[PDB]
Amino acid sequence: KAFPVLGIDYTHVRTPFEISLWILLACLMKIGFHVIPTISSIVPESCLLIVVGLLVGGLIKGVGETPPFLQSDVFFLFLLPPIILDAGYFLPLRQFTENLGTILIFAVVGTLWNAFFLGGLMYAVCLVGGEQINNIGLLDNLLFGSIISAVDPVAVLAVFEEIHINELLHILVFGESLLNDAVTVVLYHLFEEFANYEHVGIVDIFLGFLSFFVVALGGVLVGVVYGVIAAFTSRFTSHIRVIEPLFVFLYSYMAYLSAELFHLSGIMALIASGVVMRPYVEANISHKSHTTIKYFLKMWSSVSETLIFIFLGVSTVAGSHHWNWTFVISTLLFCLIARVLGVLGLTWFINKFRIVKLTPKDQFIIAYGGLRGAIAFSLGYLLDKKHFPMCDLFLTAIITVIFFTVFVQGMTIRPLVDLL
Amino acid sequence: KAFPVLGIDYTHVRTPFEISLWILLACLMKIGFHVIPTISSIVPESCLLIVVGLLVGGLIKGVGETPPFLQSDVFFLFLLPPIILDAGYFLPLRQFTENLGTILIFAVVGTLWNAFFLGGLMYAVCLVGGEQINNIGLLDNLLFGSIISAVDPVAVLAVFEEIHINELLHILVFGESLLNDAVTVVLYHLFEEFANYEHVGIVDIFLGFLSFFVVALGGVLVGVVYGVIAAFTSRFTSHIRVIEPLFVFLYSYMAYLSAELFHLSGIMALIASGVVMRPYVEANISHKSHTTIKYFLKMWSSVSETLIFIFLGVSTVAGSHHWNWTFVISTLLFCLIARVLGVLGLTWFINKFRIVKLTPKDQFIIAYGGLRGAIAFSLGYLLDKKHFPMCDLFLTAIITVIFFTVFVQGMTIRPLVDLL
């Protein structure tokens, strides 16, 4: 062997190199996405992430080598908590606790309505059209309804500006997105656990409801415990001003992992820890350290969302698909109808309770404009084949819903709202 | 199964939870290390990291479960480039290119001298005392000499202050540490490759020398290419001010990985990329983005060094040891003598070339005070057992050298320098 050390060893650096290449491509085309005169306020960033994922998936398909995949743990352990922490750390408490009732009712009850309505009506149409979807079942369909109700409405706010977005609408969609991402994951775990055993009774359903509430609240309690501990430690960190962000991220991640240890709601725990610590930091912390906390949250969340959408593109271009016309058309039309009905009913019921009525403007913004992405795909994609034999059909439906609700309900929300 | 979702599943979150627990313990005891009236300027941070690693190793030994380990790739791919980027990104060019000759000669020639002198003299004493080290060999001993010459003198600067540290001494120890960490890894790969085949000739030695230079310079060239590309892209990133740090880190890491792809010097490539980009960033970048670049470099380097030293503590408490009195005493005394002789000779030879003589002050600071750590241990620890059957003895010697040169040559450097 001439030239002793020199080599061409590529298998050594394949995961880090390709991951860095994907992130670099996404960021490069993101800075190529803002220089365009007016596209930043015409399409959401979600469209850009879809397009980047499509390009990378096309590249991988052209190369022909094995497509990468999330190993059902990298997601829940390293890609979800960044997104959740970026969202929940910048939650404005003054205008959150001011209307916690409305945000809570929308997030929880609207997600439960959307999930159960989609699951039930998808199951009903599965009973109708058969021979490819005839054998779906209920508990296998409520899971699809829950993982397709993981809506992300805050992505649409990049299309609007200071007007058309009240104080109330912004925090409302913020809380909907955040607590919806929590509740959909809790429901995902609940239904995935029920799917195993075929003997489900009234007692089992009651225990499932009880366990839903126990999971959510136990996550919350773990969050408060770790947030209080983080506040106490941040009050003792004047001397070394470089590790303060590291304490914030470490305590949030440990709250998430301690919740996930008991199968409690890690998302709720992380949100609670961030919310509880926020006021108690920024008062004991340098302004530079606060700024770098914000910057690292933004950057790390952007990287996680980018990687998830890259996997979405790889799965949609270089994946197996089970297009069924009835199921896909039914799920699109029924997710839209369920969202609209839920929003209308909930606004009608709460406007009999609040001093400031939710205007039809914001009702339309919430109903038509709630767009999936980056959690719905990931939650549906980690469904194994050992259970849920129609998980390929579930991915096809979820990908179709994501594409339709990001490229149509998100790109054509700004003009229809002027047509009020 | 009552309580459907509730569980106690710990194997799911074991690596992330224990890693976060270690980092939290280290940072907590770091902030407990600065509040002490005067210990920050009495001992280096290296001593604190050794103590944290010892405590965590004792905890793991008490628990009794399997000790974690670096899989020979996590180090070179995720723990080395953080340290190297923190060091080389803050390299002051004005006072680096001003005396590049002296820094370069110290780093390269002094490391080569230290490595070859230690290897040869360790081999000579191995020929003398036997029955446990009688069968070591030369090429198996030059590798130990190289991996024990990975000195980190900048750790001692935390013990001094604005006086006793000239303009020249600071940049000199900085460059020594940085380019020494590069050269020792290049030599590690060279000797690890030679160790395989037992038929080494004059042609092979010449080719090894040639390949050493080719590896170093090819790393440098990859570094300049990626640094120029990073500068060009940073000049086009005014619009989105949140991804600028992400471009910096992405381009540095891609330079490192592209160098490691060809087995070139990844450390040299990363240093070159950072140096080449630095002036061309901070002129096209927001001040906040520059500050967060600095903060993330510091924090991520601190985390990597902490994890490496935690592994050091785990290996020294919960590892297998092959204490040999002659080898250990010989390596301590000979590493000290080699360092002193190399420093004295090189300063004598270059003070006949420079206008500003290197004073005996800084000669003593460099010679006695060059302390190993966080690279020497890791480089020695990734030695397999399939080759190098005495790698246990090599770890024992390296750990002993680290402890002695951090707790003795680093803790008792500040008083002996007053005794000038």
Numbering used by the authors:
A (entry chain B), B (entry chain A): 87 to 506
From the manuscript:
Calcineurin B-homologous protein 1 (CHP1) is an obligate binding partner that promotes NHE1 biosynthetic maturation, cell surface expression and pH-sensitivity. We find that NHE1 assembles as a symmetrical homodimer, with each subunit undergoing an elevator-like conformational change during cation exchange.
One of the four classes featuring clearly resolved transmembrane helices was selected for focused 3D reconstructions of the transmembrane domain (TMD) of NHE1 and yielded an EM map of 3.3-Å resolution, which is rich in features, including densities for sidechains and associated lipid molecules, allowing us to build a de novo model of the NHE1 dimer. Superposition of the complex structures determined under different conditions demonstrates that the NHE1 dimer structures are nearly identical in the presence of Na+ ions, at either pH 7.5 or pH 6.5, with a root-mean-square deviation (RMSD) of 0.6 Å for 840 Cα-atom pairs. A large funnel between the dimerization domain and the core domain in each protomer is accessible only from the intracellular side, indicating that in both pH conditions the NHE1-CHP1 complex adopts an inward-facing conformation. A cluster of proton-titratable residues are located inside of the funnel chamber, including E131 in TM2 (E131TM2), D172TM3, D238TM5, D267TM6, and E391TM10, resulting in a highly negatively charged cavity which is suitable for both cation binding and proton sensing. A putative substrate ion is likely to be directly ligated in NHE1 by five oxygen atoms from sidechains of S263TM6, D267TM6, mainchain of V237TM5, and a water molecule. In the context of inward-facing NHE1-CHP1Na/7.5 and NHE1-CHP1Na/6.5 complexes, the CHP1 molecule exhibits high mobility relative to the NHE1 dimer, resulting in featureless CHP1 density in the EM maps.
